[PDB]
Design a protein around this ligand. Structure first.
Ligand code: GDP
Ligand code: GDP
Ligand code: ALF
Ligand code: K
Ligand code: MG
Ligand code: MG
Ligand code: MG
Ligand code: ZN
Lengths: 448, 333, 136, 131, 244, 230
RNA sequence: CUCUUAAGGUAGCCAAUGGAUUAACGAGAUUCCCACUGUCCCUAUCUA
């Protein structure tokens, strides 16, 4: 999988592409031909014109065709997302139009070079070359609509978030205005907008975090309305496909204060309606906005509704408030634990990754072999050393600080003799002689 | 459909319900996983793993693209445009390997009035039942004649001549007919023409590509024969090993023939190889090459065996018919 | 000085032009390497690209594993027979030309290098230094 | 300088040095490893029929016998009879590491000398018996 | 007590540095950022010495030692040897060794008590190791891998071997070294762990590209933080299963 | 960044402090810039600039006309609405083409001393079952690249053009020799298959062959264009 | 009036051989390999 498609070159519109390719021919090929030249030279001149223009068009079309993803060969989550966003039928039809234009341009170039082989005069050769280029221009101008569509699609698809469907995922779902973007802001550093009106978020947003040295992604979705898929719209279909495809831990958010504009009965009904969506995935129901109302001081009928939500195996109810750091961290950790348990238990049922995992998990241990004492050695100065604080008024000045205050890196000349541990500190800047009368001083230098 | 002026807010073909939707998603995920396993058993184990190591395959040699030249195919289309009867010459050892299906389809589509027939040459290099079975199976599509081309001691010459006379009699109002010989290099087109003329009128050599331009030969007053250079139609399934073992390329211009010697071992019987080279006891191609080199005295300086030269000689023997081999014909029905 | 190299590289006398055969010093299974290109080599009319000690080349295997053959791979020159000058003040040379198979990042395919490795190459390529048993 | 010397003693046409051959001949285990080798196509005679003194592979047993019954091998053996001439000899000649050179000299005279001579005698009688 | 740094945008810390319990050696090349990365963790508690070995920067690969001694190859110059002697206190012996295998850091893997060595080192080099470094010496390969110094990272508390080491080899080496051993990687999948990191009893320095699970494995096996024993592999088993 | 991050950044942080004034002054300068371009651009760029200016002025005039026209204020069946679409020949006289222009001398021999071969330089129709004559007796050469099988035929009624297969060359106006050689030049009467036009006689017979006249020079434009004779 | 596709499991019948895929020879024409090298990288120096 690729997960990102920002490296698609710019798609020019039809007239711009025509201008680019034709002017490239006029600039990069020679333009002066004389009627008094040899007919072979004239024919070569115009054949080169036709072949070069065809090659330019084919190069542009090939850059278009290689850049765009193959929608039927990507992961099915990406296929469904791109079908919702760009209408896969139109997408494939436009790219097929590009392919057909490439084939037709190649055919025109070959046919008119073969025809130019038999040109008898400069006028006839010029007419044939102009005919070839005009037919190429007609073919290219037939592509005016697919090129506009593909340029818009390229710009939009370069900005999609990179979602790995085979990593660890916390999905966030529910009605609008229940706190989904607020929770994503709390747990990640995604900049998803938080506003007190419905459908502020119209697309999938991704954040990341680390739990037990493991990278987790978190998907915040647009809200879903309690409607059948027949009258569901594309914005909600993004969330539907996210929940259907991404194997994950789903967090269904409920606002019991009814500040979201939806009743608790409606939220329970939506949960029971999208119950078939999250099967064999981890499920948890998070009650947001506990600083306004709480499950414990609700009504009896509403408590019965929440119990009916809890009835579905094997979901669990947890309270949270997007102004409560400890509680949002706790619910994040519980969801991560459920997801990790599911993944590890699934891998426990497999036999492929067993022996290597055991080898890389086993810690070898020694046993006796002698009555010799071997203990770690930590110097007293080391264990009395104070921790270095980069942001502190009274901190030890480092060698890089001295370098920067003297000359900076690559200009500062360190004196390596300043660290010498000698009997006399006046001996530090002493030049040690090396040669005396054809003898190395060092192999004579010896005590006694 | 999409853009600033888009009016598509709902999917066109909505699913029935969430249960059908999740069933479809599970089916798609399973199909994707199975497809990934099937494609990664080959591609990711092969080409894509080399991209991590910065490795690139050796550049394809120009000797394997011989027979796909513009001059050669210009000659081919010239002789087809000039011919009334076209004789497609196949090798009796590998006729399906030596069939030019694209040229056959072009002839049956664009020029249906030209009569395409099969001549299965080099039938003396295969067992008689193999030649009979191949003739029977190819006769289900085209009139096929078994042949052994030789100026002095041939087979099938009278049958070919009487077939050509029948074609002339059918076209008795054309004042002459032309019979163009096409096929792979080294199938024996020039040898068949020499056999029909009972005289060496076209140059013949074991090396491929001896014939370069077309040649007119007057067989009878109303029958002309056209000699054409051999053609190798381009393809992607035809590997360099297949092309080399069809006798297409000149072996002296290949890089590492020791890499192709295992193909000889797979295509030849052990008893036939051991009878041809009077050696035995090898367990792989490298040991076979080394044993043959030491027996034949093909030593480099200091006593090292000349593996490349011995391998080239083995490939030449295989292609030129000093080692017996054939491809099994289709099973009898 | 090539991707993966550690720092700059002073000029060494060029010993191996394109088309030369050097030995393979690693334990990857190859026996010799045939130089087809020199990384970082400039362009001049009629002048052959040429490698010296510490350079990265693109090479093919002539003798060795049939799996390893018929592929173009990066290699790093670790010994050269053409004498070169050290800034400590001596000209020196090895008895043979030898390189080691590597990836584009200068990491070794093999795990050990047999024979001495030049100081210049070992200092330029940390993985060569890590897999060297003898650095001059 | 001249063509003969250049094309014989070129850098790429080098042969094994006398001190290396002395170290190969010093111990019986080295003699055994050099005499008993796996069959290797890259060496003449499949790595068999190898003269340790000349450090040279012959193609056949009769070729090795003829080489041994010749003056070239005798010249090599007489060259190897003496001190192997390490760098310590040149240092001592300059007056450098003299005690180290004297220690090496007495070790050669006492330990490594007679054992190498006995190994040479055993190798010679083995070659005579097997040839 | 495991930090991450680079020497001029390179992850191979052990190539350019040497860390023992009583001193540290750093290559002189470039700025003072590498020296200050070591100095922020060590202070003026132990000597940190800029050095060159035969004019090269590969000092961890060219040198070997422990808290009691330092061995340098025969290619070291007298001036470099004198600079090392003047910078280091008399409690650490310094010896230049005439050895065919000059990359002493590659061919010798040692701590204060034991030393695995290349199986083809000289007997006098072995005796010099046992004398200057004051350790037991064993000739070993790490699952068939010579250059034990580059393919092992060792301290007095534990050891990290290259991940292709079998469990039986790990058991034999653990019984020889009298420390726990784990197989793992450093610098995002590199097998050359001894040349990827430097470690002593209270500090580890790895490359910047080392990941969180690798850092956790390193901290656990070398027992760096007080609340980090060597048997918390049972607690990190989930993350290790996920990562592997 | 993800989704419409630049739009969100403008919504959250604004633009550069001088953005509006800078854009306003650039738009004010545009008139001087246009005049300077028109008087300063040379060569191909100047010609293209003038052409584009004329097109823009025409389009603006059309838009003004449409606005003012809006401000001033075939009998098809139900299943077809909301669905869109003498005996003198049209070319009684065409340019005469000599044998010198029509044919090209092809020299043969090692020293190129024999010049009996001729090559037709125009497009030809050879018909079904064409086989090249033996080269020893091939005087007139019609190269295969110049052979034609189909033509763009336009029906004067209903205003459509169809790619139709050619059946025969009825009359080349230059010469009956060019007629029998099948030369396709301007004014040539050809027979074309009109099966896809769906023509039926008053007696009920389906018409699948009619006459057309070539209206172009195929040797100049690479294709045969013809008008049906109805 | 009629004609061709009966042949079958890695070498057959029928008459040592089933051949010109002809040894040897050649200032005949051509391809490749080892060796070798100032042909070349890239030129320098010496003699008459
Ligand atoms: N009092 C209170 N308000 C909240 C809490 N969580 C979210 N909100 C408010 O709910 C409004 C909409 O929340 P939002 O993040 O847009 O939810 P979303 O539309 O489902 O993604 C915001 O203006 C928040 O101020 C909470 O825990 N307590
Ligand atoms: N055994 C045998 N060899 C043949 C036969 N026909 C041709 N050859 C050989 O095949 C080689 C190539 O013959 P050639 O006529 O030049 O093939 P071309 O490329 O198709 O013209 C020559 O060496 C011939 O001796 C045959 O019927 N039997
Ligand atoms: F088809 Al050829 F020589 F290969 F005539
Ligand atoms: K041939
Ligand atoms: Mg939201
Ligand atoms: Mg031929
Ligand atoms: Mg040149
Ligand atoms: Zn000898």
């Amino acid at each position: 999988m690729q997960l990102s498609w920002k490296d698609i070159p710019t798609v020019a519109p039809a007239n711009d592409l025509l201008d680019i390719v034709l002017n490239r021919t006029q600039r990069k090929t020679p333009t002066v031909i004389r009627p008094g030249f040899k007919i072979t030279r004239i024919r070569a001149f115009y054949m080169r014109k036709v072949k070069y223009t065809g090659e330019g068009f084919v190069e542009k079309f090939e850059d278009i065709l290689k850049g765009f993803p193959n929608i039927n060969d990507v992961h099915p989550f990406h296929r469904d997302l791109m079908d919702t966003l760009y209408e896969k039928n139109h997408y494939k039809i436009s790219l097929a139009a590009i392919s057909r234009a490439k084939s037709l341009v190649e055919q025109v170039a070959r046919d008119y070079v073969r025809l130019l082989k038999f040109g008898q005069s400069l006028f006839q050769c010029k007419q044939l070359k102009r005919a070839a280029l005009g037919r190429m221009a007609t073919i290219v101008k037939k592509l005016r609509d697919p090129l506009a569509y593909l340029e818009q699609v390229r710009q939009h698809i370069g900005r999609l978030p990179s979602i790995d469907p085979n990593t660890r995922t916390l999905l966030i779902c529910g009605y609008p205005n229940v706190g989904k973007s607020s929770f994503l802001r709390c747990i990640t550093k995604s900049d998803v907008d938080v506003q007190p009106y419905a459908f502020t978020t119209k697309s999938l947003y991704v954040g990341h975090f680390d739990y037990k040295y493991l990278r987790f992604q978190a998907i915040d979705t647009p809200g879903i309305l309690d409607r059948p898929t027949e009258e569901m719209n594309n914005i909600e279909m993004q969330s539907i496909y996210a929940i259907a495809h991404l194997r994950s831990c789903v967090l269904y958010f409920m606002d019991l204060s009814e500040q979201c504009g939806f009743t608790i009965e409606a939220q329970v009904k939506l949960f029971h309606s999208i119950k078939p969506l999250f099967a064999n995935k981890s499920v948890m129901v998070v009650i947001n906005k506990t600083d306004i109302i709480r499950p414990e001081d609700l009504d009896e009928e509403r408590a019965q509704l929440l119990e009916s939500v809890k009835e579905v195996p094997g979901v669990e109810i947890m309270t949270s408030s997007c102004q409560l750091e400890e509680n949002v961290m706790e619910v994040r950790n519980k969801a991560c634990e459920k997801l990790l348990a599911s993944r590890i238990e699934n891998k426990l049922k497999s036999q492929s990754r067993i022996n290597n995992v055991l080898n890389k998990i086993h810690v070898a241990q020694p046993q006796a072999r002698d009555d010799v004492k071997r203990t770690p050695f930590i110097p007293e100065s080391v264990k009395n050393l104070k921790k270095y604080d980069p942001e502190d008024p009274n901190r030890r000045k480092l060698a890089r600080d001295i370098e920067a205050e003297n000359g900076g890196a690559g200009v500062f000349n360190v004196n390596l003799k300043d660290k010498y541990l000698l009997e006399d500190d006046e001996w530090k800047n002493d030049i040690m002689p090396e040669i005396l009368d054809g003898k190395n001083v060092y192999d004579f230098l010896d005590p006694e | 459909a999409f853009g600033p002026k888009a009016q598509r807010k709902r999917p066109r073909l909505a699913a029935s319900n969430l249960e059908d939707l999740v069933k479809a998603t599970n089916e798609d995920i399973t199909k994707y996983e199975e497809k990934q396993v099937l494609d990664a058993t080959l591609g990711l184990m092969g080409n894509q793993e080399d991209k991590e190591n910065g490795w690139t395959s050796a550049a394809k040699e120009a000797i394997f693209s011989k027979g796909q030249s513009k001059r050669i195919w210009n000659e081919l289309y010239k002789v087809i445009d000039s011919s009334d009867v076209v004789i497609h010459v196949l090798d009796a050892r590998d006729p399906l390997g030596t069939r030019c299906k694209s040229v056959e389809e072009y002839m049956k589509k664009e020029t249906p009035h030209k009569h395409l027939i099969y001549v299965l040459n080099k039938c003396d290099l295969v067992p008689t039942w193999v030649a009979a079975a191949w003739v029977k199976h190819l006769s289900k599509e085209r009139p096929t004649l078994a042949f052994h081309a030789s100026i002095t001691n041939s087979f099938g010459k009278g049958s070919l001549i009487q077939l050509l006379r029948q074609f002339s009699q059918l076209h008795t109002d054309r004042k002459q007919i032309s019979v163009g010989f096409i096929g792979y290099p080294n199938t024996g087109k020039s040898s068949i023409i020499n056999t029909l003329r009972k005289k060496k009128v076209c140059q013949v050599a074991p090396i491929p590509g001896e014939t370069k331009v077309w040649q007119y030969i007057t067989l009878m007053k109303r029958i002309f024969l056209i000699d054409c250079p051999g053609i190798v139609p381009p393809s992607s399934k035809d590997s360099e090993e297949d092309i080399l073992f069809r006798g297409v390329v000149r072996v002296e211009h290949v890089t590492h023939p020791e890499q192709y010697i295992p193909g000889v071992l797979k295509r030849c019987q052990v008893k036939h190889l051991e009878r041809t080279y009077e050696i035995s006891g090898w367990k792989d191609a490298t040991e076979f090459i080394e044993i043959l080199a030491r027996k034949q005295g093909r030593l480099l300086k200091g006593g090292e065996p000349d593996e490349s030269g011995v391998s080239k000689q083995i490939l030449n023997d295989f292609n030129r018919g000093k080692i017996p081999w054939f491809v099994l014909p289709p099973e009898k029905e | 000085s090539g991707n993966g190299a550690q720092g700059t590289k002073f000029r060494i006398s060029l010993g191996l032009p394109v088309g030369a055969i050097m030995n393979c010093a690693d334990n990857s299974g190859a026996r010799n390497l045939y130089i087809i290109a020199v990384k970082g080599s400039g362009s001049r009319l009629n002048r052959l690209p040429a490698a010296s000690l510490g350079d990265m080349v693109m090479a093919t295997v002539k003798k060795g594993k049939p799996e390893l053959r018929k592929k173009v791979m990066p290699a790093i020159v670790v010994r050269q027979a053409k004498s070169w000058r050290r800034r400590d003040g001596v000209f020196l040379y090895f008895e043979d030309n030898a390189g080691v198979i590597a990836n584009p990042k200068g990491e070794m395919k093999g795990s050990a290098i047999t024979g001495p490795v030049g100081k210049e190459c070992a200092d330029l390529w940390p993985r060569v230094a890590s897999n060297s048993g003898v650095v001059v | 300088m001249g063509r003969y010397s250049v094309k014989r003693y070129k850098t790429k046409r080098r042969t094994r040095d006398l001190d290396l051959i002395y170290n190969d001949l010093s111990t019986k285990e080295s003699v055994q490893k050099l005499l008993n080798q796996p069959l290797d196509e890259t060496k003449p005679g499949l790595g068999q029929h190898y003269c340790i003194h000349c450090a040279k592979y012959m193609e056949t047993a009769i070729a090795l016998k003829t080489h041994l019954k010749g003056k070239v091998h005798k010249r090599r053996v007489k060259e190897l009879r003496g001190v192997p001439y390490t760098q310590e000899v040149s240092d001592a000649a300059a007056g450098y590491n003299l005690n180290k050179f004297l220690n090496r000299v007495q070790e050669i005279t006492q330990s490594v000398g007679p054992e190498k001579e006995s190994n040479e005698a055993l190798l010679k009688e083995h070659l005579d018996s097997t040839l | 007590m495991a930090t991450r740094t680079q020497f001029e945008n390179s992850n191979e810390i052990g190539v350019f540095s040497k860390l023992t319990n009583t001193y540290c050696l750093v290559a002189v090349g470039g700025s003072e950022n590498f020296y200050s990365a070591f100095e922020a963790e060590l202070g003026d508690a132990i000597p940190i010495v800029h050095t060159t070995i035969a004019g090269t920067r590969i000092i961890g690969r060219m040198t070997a030692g422990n808290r009691r001694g330092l061995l340098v190859p025969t290619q070291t110059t007298d001036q470099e040897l004198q600079h090392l002697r003047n910078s280091l206190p008399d409690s650490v012996k310094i010896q230049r060794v005439e050895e065919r295998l000059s990359a002493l850091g590659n061919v010798i893997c040692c701590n204060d008590y034991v030393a695995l060595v290349h199986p083809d080192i000289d007997r006098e080099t072995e005796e010099l190791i046992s004398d200057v470094l004051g350790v037991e010496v064993f000739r070993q390969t790490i699952s068939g891998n010579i250059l034990v110094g580059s393919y092992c990272s060792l301290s007095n508390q534990g050891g990290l071997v290259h991940p292709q080491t079998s469990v039986q080899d790990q058991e034999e080496l653990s019984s020889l070294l009298q420390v726990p051993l784990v197989a793992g990687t450093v610098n995002r999948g590199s097998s050359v762990v001894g040349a990827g990191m430097v470690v002593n009893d209270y500090l580890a320095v790895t490359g910047l590209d080392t990941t969180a699970p690798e850092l956790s494995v390193i901290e656990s096996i070398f027992r760096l933080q007080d609340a980090q024993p060597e048997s918390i592999s049972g607690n990190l088993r989930d993350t290790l299963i996920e990562t592997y | 960044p993800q989704n419409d991050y630049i739009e969100r950044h403008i919504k959250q942080h604004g633009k550069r402090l001088d953005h509006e004034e800078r854009k306003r002054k650039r738009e004010a300068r545009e008139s001087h810039k246009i005049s300077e371009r028109a008087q300063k651009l040379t060569g191909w760029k100047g010609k293209q600039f003038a052409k584009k200016r004329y097109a823009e002025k025409v389009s603006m005039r059309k838009k003004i006309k449409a606005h003012e026209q809006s401000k001033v204020k075939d009998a098809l069946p139900t299943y077809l609405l909301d669905r869109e679409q003498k005996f003198s020949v049209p070319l009684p006289k065409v340019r005469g083409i000599s044998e010198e222009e029509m044919f090209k001398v092809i020299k043969t021999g090692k020293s190129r001393s024999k010049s009996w071969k001729r090559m037709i330089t125009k497009h030809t129709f050879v018909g079904e079952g064409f086989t090249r004559r033996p080269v020893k007796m091939e005087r007139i050469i019609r190269p295969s690249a110049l052979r034609q099988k189909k033509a763009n035929v336009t029906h004067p009624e209903l205003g459509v053009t169809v790619f139709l297969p050619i059946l025969a060359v009825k009359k080349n106006p230059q010469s009956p020799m060019y007629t029998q050689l099948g030369v396709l030049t301007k004014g040539t009467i050809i027979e074309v298959n009109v099966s896809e036009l769906g023509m039926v006689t008053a007696g009920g017979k389906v018409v699948w062959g009619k006459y057309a006249q070539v209206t172009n020079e195929p040797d100049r434009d690479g294709c045969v264009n013809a008008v049906l004779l109805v």
